Design a binder for this molecule. Structure first.
Ligand code: BFB
Ligand code: BFB
Ligand code: CA
Ligand code: CA
Ligand code: CA
Ligand code: CA
Ligand code: CA
Ligand code: CA
Ligand code: CA
Ligand code: CA
Ligand code: CA
Ligand code: CA
Ligand code: CL
Ligand code: CL
Ligand code: CL
Ligand code: CL
Ligand code: CL
Ligand code: CL
Ligand code: CL
Ligand code: CL
Lengths: 640, 640
């Protein structure tokens, strides 16, 4: 199951074959044996393993211990597991014998120069193929999309040099052992190389001075450099550092091959070794994971929303990053905070939306720190649904398959959508197979407007919450059956243009509003069945949250503040204050929200956001982004 | 495991839902039930199946036989397995009851209009995915690369019409059943469609008059036509005929999807059905299969070679197609005769080489008959190895995997080849994973110059024959040991420029020739080990044929006529007459060839081809092509 070579010898002159350590070499002869050959012996220098074996069966046996009856169906295998100290310091001798004369009929001498050449980085086996699963192997290469060097205002993938002392942590090591006699390399070339396609996807740096000098990490393989001649500057081992340049995309499967080759120019190759890296994909974090940093804007009239986000994220231990002006508020539409995982350094990565104009400068300026990669996709042609539309589910099981990193959720329409480049990126990450949903019926049309996952220690670890006009129907009808129909919804709120205060009786007896909410619930029910199919969830995990919808056209906006589309930080969730019907001094919508959520251990704190948001078609989740702790499950044993 | 719909009803007004036959519909309500609801009954029109089931377990039970205690965790499923005869001719009625008053509290009525819509072609299940293996399913679509219509000088894929009466045999049927009430279609649209990418890869024709009129096969889906409105011209069933336009290539995985959709414009879709075709790949035929037609040229000085090919192919029952002038001889370099298989009509297909100049007109003019497809690949940039370099192995087992259609064999060099477009085509056929070999050392450099498979009822059904200078070494040395060293090789042959007659002693004692043949055998041994690894063959299946090699440069031509590179037609093989050393009135090389081949039942007939060929670097196989009977093993259950 190893490399096989056939080196033939001649009874006229000895041969000077060069072999590679560990590789087997079949030994045969040009022409025929002596005329009266009946037996043969074979002998080898210490450190030269000689085995005899029939060509039919595959059982090996030491060959230098007896005089073998001659048989053309036998074959001799020579293996040198250790490199030679000097050229041709070992040899094999085959003598042919007959019972007629006592002396050997003929000799066949083969001198051997053994060289130990191997290229290895981190062999997680064939070493030339990448296989998925817990029993899989292969090296992982990152993309290095961050800024570790403070001198640069640009990305770390752009420089052909390495002018940072800790940027090397983002790269992958690759050791080339080249043990053997030095004079051999006066006759043979050592060439590292890679295909031009892979060369345009990653860069390799040789080392000329260990661990101290930035100029010593000499760039040897890049966009135009497809091959390089390793001078063996350190002796029997050369260290290389490879950094990826791109993420898996529509045309890039995600595998790059690096080869080393020994050439005989005084060129003809006699040995080649390969190493295959897989570019680690971009992984999204659903709301079920523990949060790390909460992001929120501060706009010309954002006064108490920031304070509420602060005093409510301090219960989950978050960093509370704040933006001074946002050039305007929608911090959840411009960026999505995922990560890329490696067995040495897993770093979080921001994905920048092509929905630009307000926060278009925030990610590439003040979000890619030392360990914070940056990736973005802009189409050549336009985005209307963007990263409010992009969410991720918890780990699920559906269609027989298991999704331990969840599935991606984006919206669209069935008969005709998010731009094709973003779709291609998400589908090419291959680790969270996306599920395209129906969101085109909403005004802005983002998935997070009707769907939100929440952690709950029961059932499946989480609950999927869906907005449901029928839930509000049931709640308002059951409250009417008590006599509180004259309770008003928008009663307690700072009214500037005096949004008209509607009552329960007015809402329930408004035919157009009720029919429009029935249509909205039919859309949400279609999405609900698609979610149950593609995520394998039951009604035990699905909770309906009461929510009505306004409209000024054929598309849907929220009637009162959207209860779903909330900020979910582990045990604490910030929900938009619905300003519902006050029945006993407390909002009945808030009472229903508590009755639905707090039995799951969560604590619901409602934020007044009627003036800052919900009048520009957004809620707290629309104004708050968050990055989360990566999954414990590693992405390589995923068997897609 | 079917499509799931949720249709909600209201206690205020009945609903008029339209459902699809076989599809389940969950029935719920907007808002809450009556105030004192304790029980409920459900009733359905004959032909309406109503089941009750808890939302946790998945056991169904008929629901219209008792009065059920009310439970919000129960759900009712409505299924109509048969289409309706008139609009809303069936209905479901849900009554809510209490033990307090004897009459029902409220009713909920849902009228149903059932329509049976289904698109099916040949469902070999999900019907939207193509899976490999004996337990796999999916439809097969051909490419229709032949000329069934005599009126056209061009291919059958080029016309947008169908002006042939038997070209339809090459297409694939696709039936769309649309049973239901006719008035429904006054309100709903029926749309067939496909993605523009798939639209550029295949064409679809609707039918407007059965089996008689060519103009009735109306083109509905093509390069620009991505959607079409089916008028239901025949009633409850429409027939479509789809023909493929391309083979699987680097950018085309080989799958095309056709969808049908029911729209509600008085548009909103409520049902969509899909059908996925796989384009059948191009399959090559190795020499082990029985032959059908032998092809050979007739050139200005080809006198007895054609006669020998004729009188030697008449033993295997071949058609013996002859070319009058070939515009010059290399009929094996211009074309490769494979086939494309379908469950209805498997047709042979020629693959035209980009090596043009001599026979560039033969395939597209006089080889694509009624059932003879044509495919070709020309690069935008040049071919130097072409279709002498392209061969195919018998079914093998290697690397654990099983190759029941064999593997493709093409030549090249390791450190740097056949053009990339041909490589991409062969690799994209996906059914015979190619093995790139080392052939760059030869003058013309074709795989068939040193490798040939032959049928033999023993071992594995076949024997791989490799040219070996060492075999000729052994033969000439064993003949020297008798005293026939003064026997001459090129003795009996028509000598015009008097090729010098060499003897065995002169050949064996020529140091340059012997060393060059040793290098040649080392190359062939590298290829031999690669073949043993990639085909899983042992020495029991490998036979070495004696062959020496000339040279006027650093590349290799044949010394005497190449014994391998022969015409293999089942039990009969035409071998080039080697004109070897005559020892007892018979050529000793022919005696060795017989001793190696005839014990396998084969019969060796040698053809004088020294003047026609072997002086322009070719042998009988270089001047003879052949198509063979397709494999009995079908390509769809191949599990690549
Ligand atoms: C949850 C979420 N991401 N919501 C997005 C906020 C909607 C926003 N709409 C506006 O800014 C707007 C307000 C008033 C008039 C016109 C537009 C958007 N375009 O995404
Ligand atoms: C087995 C096979 N396909 N052989 C190919 C024939 C070689 C041919 N060479 C010539 O025609 C030639 C003759 C004399 C001088 C220069 C070229 C070819 N080019 O393929
Ligand atoms: Ca750098
Ligand atoms: Ca870095
Ligand atoms: Ca942006
Ligand atoms: Ca770093
Ligand atoms: Ca998002
Ligand atoms: Ca046609
Ligand atoms: Ca045809
Ligand atoms: Ca051609
Ligand atoms: Ca036909
Ligand atoms: Ca061929
Ligand atoms: Cl050798
Ligand atoms: Cl893709
Ligand atoms: Cl509901
Ligand atoms: Cl308030
Ligand atoms: Cl409905
Ligand atoms: Cl390909
Ligand atoms: Cl041999
Ligand atoms: Cl003769």
């Amino acid at each position: 199951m190893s490399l096989q070579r056939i080196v033939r010898v001649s009874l006229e002159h000895p041969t000077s074959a060069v072999c590679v350590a560990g590789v087997e070499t079949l030994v045969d002869i040009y022409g025929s044996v002596p005329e009266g050959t009946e037996m043969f012996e074979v002998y080898g220098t210490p450190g030269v393993d000689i085995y005899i074996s029939p060509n039919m069966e595959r059982g090996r046996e030491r060959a230098d211990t007896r005089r073998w009856r001659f048989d053309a169906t036998l074959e001799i295998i020579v293996v040198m597991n250790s490199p030679s100290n000097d050229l041709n310091d070992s040899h094999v001798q085959i003598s042919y014998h007959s019972s007629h004369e006592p002396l050997p009929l003929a000799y066949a001498v083969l001198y051997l120069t053994c060289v130990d050449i191997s290229l290895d980085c981190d062999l997680n086996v064939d070493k030339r193929q990448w296989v998925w699963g817990p029993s899989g192997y292969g090296g992982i290469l990152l993309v290095n999309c961050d800024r570790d060097d403070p001198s640069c205002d640009v990305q770390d993938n752009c420089d052909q040099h390495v002018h940072c002392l800790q940027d090397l942590e983002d790269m992958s090591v690759m050791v080339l052992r080249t043990q053997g006699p030095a004079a051999l390399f006066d006759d043979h070339k050592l060439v590292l190389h890679t295909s031009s396609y892979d060369a345009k996807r990653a860069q390799v740096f040789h080392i000329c001075g260990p661990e101290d000098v930035c100029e010593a990490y000499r760039h040897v393989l890049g966009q135009d450099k497809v091959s390089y001649e390793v001078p063996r500057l350190h002796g029997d081992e050369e260290r290389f550092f490879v950094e990826g340049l791109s993420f898996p995309d529509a045309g890039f499967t995600g595998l790059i091959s690096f080869h080393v080759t020994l050439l005989d120019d005084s060129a003809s190759p006699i040995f080649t070794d390969t190493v295959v890296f897989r570019v680690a994909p971009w992984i999204m974090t659903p709301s079920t994971l523990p949060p790390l940093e909460v992001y929120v804007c501060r706009v010309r009239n954002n006064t108490c929303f920031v304070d509420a986000v602060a005093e409510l994220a301090r219960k989950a231990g978050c960093k509370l990053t704040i933006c001074p002006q946002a050039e305007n508020r929608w911090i959840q539409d411009e960026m999505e905070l995922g990560y890329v995982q490696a067995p040495h350094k897993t770093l979080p990565v921001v994905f920048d939306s092509p929905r630009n104009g307000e926060l278009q400068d925030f990610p590439y300026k003040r979000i890619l720190g030392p360990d914070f990669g940056y990736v973005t996709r802009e189409p050549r042609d336009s985005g209307l649904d963007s990263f409010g539309n992009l969410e991720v589910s918890p780990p699920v099981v559906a269609n027989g398959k298991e999704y331990p990193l969840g599935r991606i959720l984006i919206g669209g329409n069935l008969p005709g959508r998010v731009t094709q480049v973003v779709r291609d990126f998400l589908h090419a990450q291959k680790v969270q197979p996306p599920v395209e949903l129906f969101v085109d019926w909403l005004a802005v049309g983002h998935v997070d407007e009707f769907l939100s996952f929440v952690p709950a220690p029961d059932g499946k670890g989480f609950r999927m919450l869906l907005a449901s006009p029928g839930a509000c129907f049931k709640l308002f009808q059951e409250k009417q059956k008590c006599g509180h129909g004259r309770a008003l919804l928008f009663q307690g709120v700072v009214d500037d243009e005096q949004v008209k205060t509607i009552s329960i009786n007015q809402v329930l007896s408004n035919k157009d509003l009720i029919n429009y909410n029935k249509f909205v619930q039919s859309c949400i029910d279609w999405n609900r069945e698609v979610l149950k199919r593609e995520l394998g969830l039951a009604e035990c995990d699905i909770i309906d949250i009461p929510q009505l919808f306004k409209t000024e056209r054929k598309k849907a906006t929220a009637f009162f503040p959207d209860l779903v589309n909330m900020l979910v930080l582990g045990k604490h969730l910030g929900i938009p204050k619905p300003f519902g019907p006050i029945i006993n001094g407390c909002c009945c919508l808030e009472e229903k929200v508590r009755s639905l959520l707090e039995p799951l251990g969560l604590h619901c704190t409602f934020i007044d956001d009627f003036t800052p948001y919900h009048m520009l078609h957004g809620e707290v989740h629309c104004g708050t982004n968050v990055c989360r702790k990566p999954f414990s499950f590693k992405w390589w044993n995923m068997v897609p």
